[PDB]
Symmetry: D2
Subunit: 249 residues, 4 copies
């Protein structure tokens, strides 16, 4: 029943939405889970909700010293990593005209830079035969109004799964990108200015998607679990689109 029995997993962006739903599923499948994020309140709540086999770690992935501290804790508590889900990321809508340097840096620091260092500093603790999952996005293959940096960053993240497949093959570490479409999580709500707008952005995505609905966080976690588990043992360097068909038709 337990497809991740006694495996140790680290999930950045674990106190919310996709990160948290995956943490739950992971624990359900008998893993020990480190959830990682900046907000202490939410971390504590997420850990409470998860219930068992979980450690909350406060860290900002754009801060190298926070990562070092993270992996020290990981090392003390469990000693090695079987599954790394480099999932923390963020979107701010700006069109080409509106792009400032600060906006650019905010996007690329958390989505690309933070992720690069998240994976680099996990390397000493990563088990041979382990599995790294990167959270790209359908944005990374689409041309969406005012998504200039987000989309570019996530296209960067998909590339890294290809490169790290070659760089880590010697250790039999599998690296795969998951690209979600519309998933019912705080990232949608936190970008609109009004709760009215959010009802409409969701109905818009549903119309565009063959399966006629936004995805549930549970469903992204299940896709990530596949990549985390032995089931994907011959799956390497891919972009797994979990978007109800959005980019496929």
């Amino acid at each position: 029943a337990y497809r991740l029995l006694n495996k140790t997993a680290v999930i950045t962006g674990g106190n919310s939405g996709i990160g948290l739903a995956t943490a739950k599923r992971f624990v359900a499948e008998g893993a020990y889970v480190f959830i990682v994020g900046r907000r202490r309140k939410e971390l504590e709540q997420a850990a409470a909700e998860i219930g068992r086999n979980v450690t909350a770690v406060k860290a900002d992935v754009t801060k190298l010293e926070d990562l070092d501290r993270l992996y020290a804790i990981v090392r003390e508590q469990r000693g090695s990593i079987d599954v790394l889900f480099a999932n923390s990321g963020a979107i701010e809508q700006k069109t080409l005209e509106e792009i400032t340097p600060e906006h650019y840096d905010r996007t690329f620091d958390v989505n690309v830079r933070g992720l690069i260092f998240t994976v680099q500093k996990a390397l000493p603790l990563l088990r041979d035969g382990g599995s790294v999952i990167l959270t790209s996005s359908v944005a990374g293959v689409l041309g969406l109004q005012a998504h200039d940096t987000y989309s570019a960053a996530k296209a960067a993240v998909r590339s890294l799964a290809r490169t790290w497949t070659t760089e880590l093959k010697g250790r039999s570490i599998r690296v795969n990108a998951v690209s979600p479409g519309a998933i019912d999580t705080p990232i949608i709500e936190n970008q609109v200015s009004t709760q009215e707008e959010a009802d409409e952005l969701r109905a818009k995505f549903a119309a565009a998607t063959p399966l006629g609905r936004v995805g549930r966080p549970e469903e992204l976690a299940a896709a990530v679990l596949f990549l985390a588990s032995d089931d994907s043992s011959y799956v390497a360097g891919i972009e797994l689109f979990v978007d109800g068909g959005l980019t496929q038709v």
Copy 2:
């Protein structure tokens, strides 16, 4: 523990290699499995190996009347289909110069035509919310010497998963393509002329593949299971490469 409990599945090409390994895994996960193929001896042996919850059906997918008969049996015995794995297919190496009309028809009849009618005639029995998996190939995105028709046919198969995602969305039926790389199955042995050559074709593919090895049939089955199961509930119309990174780097 049982991710396909009481679900009814039909697998063309089920007496051998990938089809059979999937049948096993399916039954292990509590499904009832129809295995389908031409050779009666092997069908009976496969059913024996599988052991429980299995029905062998003799059918040639290029023969419409065989398909009608298949689905009559399916209907009588179980009534409906939750998972269809349209997997039967075959390869014959010929270069552009060498291509005869007979060769062309042999490839396209089993790989494309047979498959089309396999799925068409399953539609009445297919459950709403069900899952169809088509077996494409890495050939469908590569330019491999003397693979002219095979590769084209399998690229045709990947396309059908996109089209049928749109045509079946109303019934919430998910259709996905699985594209295997080198997998340790009879299809490799049955195309060479000598047992010596086969040792070398396997070592060649291993060198080309980041994971440094041919895949085990068990591993393709696990990938197919993902697509068959609820875990992929928000995965539609995709090409899942199970090739150890071959086409990804």
Copy 3:
């Protein structure tokens, strides 16, 4: 001024739409053009419109003996081929449910089978350093209602350009796929039942396309010219989307 000066070109599907516009542009660029098709009236009109350096040849690409005859004529008149544009193809809308064997064979015979033999029988006459262009379609990467066989066939055509890039590299022959989106040609009109419907199918495609308009045949020809010319001398095995951004965003 003349980018195809004294080069000999063969264009199947040359009496209409894309084939003809390319023939014009080719002759404008100083090529000698064979146009090829079934309808004698239209062939003669097309040759008239083109004006100079053109030979019309009646042939059905699904008939091997018509191809042999074609290449006999080609050989007698000009002796060799610098540019082959395997362009003849046809669409009939039918959903999965509606698919008959006759429909299937009609689509695959002209779009895939005919094309394969078109290119195979050109090989003896094809110049080293020559250029073959296959006409795929945006359909080959999309999931369009009732396009089941068309789309699959054109996805097959794209594959062949990859395979033939490998098989013909020894002779330095470049093979590339051109995939058009909506282009203002008879293929749109000939599939609807009413002239009213055609006004609406065109306005629908325009809305879906970033450039906000259907393409002019002149524009597909220019894209084909690029692939035919020395400009694309380091371009091999590609899918050149001429669709105003349809499949790219």
Copy 4:
């Protein structure tokens, strides 16, 4: 004969390799060309080699004020821009383990950040109906050892062509990515430590490429010309692989 007659074009990275070969070809086709780069010596030499209708501008794309100055000059001298070729970029080889923050910022500043602001600040001067060409790379779809940031940056650049296809469609400005493979330019020599190594890195790429050779800068320029010209008037948001078939087979 003159495909870019009286059109004004701006080429970042124009004193060297691809930038310069494209500048030459552009002028040959009757354009007026701004070449842009950091090194004053080379700029002056490039302008000398080009001969006519050229203005050299010293600018560092990572420096906003340099760009502002560049576009002031452009505006005073020629007023508007018909063709922007955002081409400046740079590679430094480092594996995941080896990645420092400085290395990361060097790559992403020139390859991604600089390019974003290059295109943003051209917008006021860009003509309706104009053409923007971004230089991605085959690296953006491959997993190459120690190409971690380069490949991710270039994958970011391809994304930008998608997003800007949508954002600029209103003004009928076409944005396309060109992704070169191995091209015979200083970027190959400037990354090795020894002139011996460079003979071997070139023979390695030649073996991997169907056309059996590295590309000439002249050949990338011809491909860029196609994108710059009216020939590609219905080609938007694409990735044009100019790699002799490297990524296509």
